[model samples]
Target: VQVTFTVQKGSDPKKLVLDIKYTRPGDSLAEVELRQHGSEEWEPLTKKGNVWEVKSSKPLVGPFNFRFMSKGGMRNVFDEVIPTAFSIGKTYKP
Candidate 1:
């Protein structure tokens, strides 16, 4: 999914919040997962109206990609579009 976001540039020690609008494809909720740089563990997070948030104090000099999964599987609804991506210093605006 193409997630349009503005990675805010503020002071140091910034928290990267992955702002996204995710869906389970079939209109049901999906259990999403996130994997950080050098972190093997996948962390669980919450969402609203396809929008998910993650607070990251880990500094990213470049770009990275997290994971989104439907714990019970998704409906694969291509007609409906949900935004997803890894961004910094912002909340879910959806």
Candidate 2:
């Protein structure tokens, strides 16, 4: 199964909204978490129906690296590094 992330601007100018969706037959029960590169704490995404979403608490700037973790049972799955640069009101899938 494949996981995809859709990023867009939040209501606030300094924040960002992330929408996470999984491919067909994906694990709906798994907990998905995300964090910016170099950050220690992983922010938990809220599940809304079939999508998991989160909003950035801090101001996002420049090109950044992020990653995802899907936790289920004994598995600690980590996705590859995704680098992105943000612009206001623009949507990105990285």
lDDT winner among the candidates? 2
Q: Which tens-of-lDDT digit does each residue in 5-87 have in candidate 2?
A: 56544524344455655443534446666665566666666766555555665654324344444443433445333344544
- Pairs with steric clashes in candidate 2: none
Error of 1 at 61 (Å): 7.5
lDDT of each: 0.41, 0.50
Runs with alpha carbons beyond 4 Å of true place in candidate 2: 9-14, 24-26, 48-51, 61-84, 87-94
